Design a protein around this nucleic acid. Structure first.
Ligand code: HPA
Ligand code: HPA
Lengths: 339, 339
DNA sequence: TACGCAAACGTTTGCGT
DNA sequence: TACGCAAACGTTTGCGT
């Protein structure tokens, strides 16, 4: 169970055992064999803890997420894991739930577990967080959900959420719409505010005013979707189309209309944002802006690995791009032909 | 950065530094202080690798899942993580994708990373797997998705899937139905076969024959849901109700009916199985058998921790129970009153 | 040419006194 | 009464010869 024990059966030095276990130097066949034999009977499993102590790296990665259930989230993480595996890494998944303490806790356990690098996905970034995060500038780390490039000590990957909001708005416009509504994700977030402003910009350009009774805040959870949509058509004058800050919340919105007996999109058009795996199977097939979730994983990993192996020190940042998916939840507005 | 470096600033022994860092023995205030001061400036972070080497435990847990995206799955895992965190543990998430090699790979990396215990969720359990899994009887481990209690070296937690299938079938019956259909998950699985037989039993009791054209296999993915439902009503004689082996696939089924212009449930009743967080927001609100996902996590953790701390050796097994949730996707059948 | 010896990486802990 | 010394846990590796 210990290298020595193997070395004994082998009738060889522990150095030899190491060497053949790692092809780190030439070893006589006859020798290599004996070691293996030993390694087999003794049913040895080289301790990575041992190794990690000497070589100075755990070959493990720590992802400090916000939540692992939410479809959006769930998708990215499964990608990141894909990468770790294929590249030799081990993933340590941690969810802070946007809890400062919880954050500082997980952050600390990881430093102690000595992770080669950190993948951050905290959603909101108040200074107090930006602070502890700094405190760990030593661990190589890339944040995947910043709007811009918040800190100067980590890599970023920008989703261009705004350009997505803008994309969503345009469509709606070029479809015949002028009385639109919007349910955005928590403003304390990129995917919240960012997607929204991108949208409010196409609006300004269109010369469209979004009456505030038509703007109800969500939290990326189907219920809020439900409750907001409810609050939008629960009014005397209601929009003809609505842009939903995220698909799960969209799904929330879809329900309420059905329960209010409104037809989507015959009565109301809905445009979501995320394009999660189940979206097409929404009823009706949800039209939405698709965020490259996979490349967001791989691209994050990749930058980290860089800093890791090539011991990079300067902070990078890489952009990705959302692309409009067209489905069946949007219908022509009152102004299509008048364009 | 090393205990010694702290001990120096402190003007004390590394043993003292350890002792105050762990309240493992009394230390003069004045002393305790100095250490902390040092610990602070030096910005020390005790290596858990160091520690793990001496004390013989990593205080980390390894979950060998099948997939982390699928709603069902995603839910359990987020629970398991919840537990690890609150109980001091670190989670290493691994997805084998039902790939033998991939399995044997992750299994091995974990043994090497020396995890205090293993949480298994492989879905299918062919002998070749049951074999390598055995090979690691040394690591304390509990499998969370066995039908019965397959192996004699791990703990089990039984979901009673059958009793769930049976529950699903009964309802449908007691609702007026007699021409029912079924789309079950891959038979190589508990949640597949198990849920199904439980269902086929209420049928036998009801004296109901399920014509095989009305039995189409799914894979727990919305698409199969879609394609099966499609194949069920795409026939001359179609059931009046259908039991869907799992909610995501249900969601698949819901779409197709809509696209085929059939009304759920006015034209067709659907009963799912899983009761995942979004289910209520399905359109219409999906009626289904709910599987206690959380308790499935906590209960798994808990057993493992037992074996862990209380060094248990005998294999346990604990049952959980599915409970019918009633929603809006089921309507009375032709025989309600005739009962 | 093929291998072995000892030091070492960062801790915790047994015995001290 | 409060603390320190050295051994040790499982490896990898520098120099050998
Ligand atoms: O912050 C978020 N949470 C959940 N889903 C999301 N989709 C986009 N942003 C988010
Ligand atoms: O094996 C499964 N996979 C995905 N979802 C599921 N829900 C129940 N069983 C399963």
């Amino acid at each position: 169970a210990t290298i020595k024990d193997v070395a004994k059966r082998a009738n060889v030095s522990t150095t030899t055992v190491s060497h053949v276990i790692n092809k780190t130097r030439f070893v006589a066949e006859e020798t290599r064999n004996a070691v293996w034999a030993a390694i087999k009977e003794l049913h040895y499993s080289p301790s990575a803890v041992a190794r990690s102590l000497k070589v100075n790296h755990t070959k493990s990665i720590g992802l400090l997420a916000t939540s692992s259930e939410a479809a959006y989230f769930a998708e990215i993480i499964e990608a990141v894991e894909k990468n770790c595996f294929q590249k030799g890494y081990t993933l340590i998944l941690g969810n802070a739930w946007n809890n400062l303490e919880k954050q500082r806790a997980y952050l600390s356990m990881m430093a102690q577990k000595r992770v080669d690098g950190l993948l951050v996905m905290c959603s909101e970034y108040p200074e107090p967080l930006l602070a502890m995060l700094e405190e760990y500038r030593h661990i190589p780390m890339v944040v995947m959900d910043f709007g811009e490039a918040k800190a100067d000590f980590t890599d970023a990957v920008i989703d261009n959420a705004f350009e997505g909001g803008y994309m969503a708005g345009r469509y709606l416009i070029e479809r015949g719409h002028r009385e639109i509504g919007v349910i955005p994700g928590p403003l304390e977030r990129n995917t919240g505010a960012g997607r929204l402003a991108g949208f409010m910009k196409a609006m300004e350009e269109a010369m469209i005013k979004v009456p505030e009774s038509w703007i109800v805040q969500g939290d990326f959870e189907p219920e809020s979707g439900y409750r907001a949509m409810q609050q939008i058509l629960s009014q005397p004058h209601r929009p003809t189309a609505v842009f939903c800050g995220g698909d799960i919340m969209a799904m929330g919105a879809l329900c309420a209309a059905d329960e209010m007996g409104l037809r989507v999109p015959q009565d109301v058009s809905l445009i979501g944002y995320d394009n999660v795996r189940n979206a097409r199977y929404f009823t009706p097939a949800l039209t939405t802006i698709h965020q490259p979730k996979d490349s967001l994983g791989e691209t994050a990993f990749n930058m980290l690995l860089d800093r890791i192996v090539n011991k990079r020190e300067e902070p990078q940042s890489i952009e990705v791009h959302p692309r409009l998916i067209e489905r069946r939840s949007v219908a022509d507005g009152p102004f299509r032909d008048y364009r």
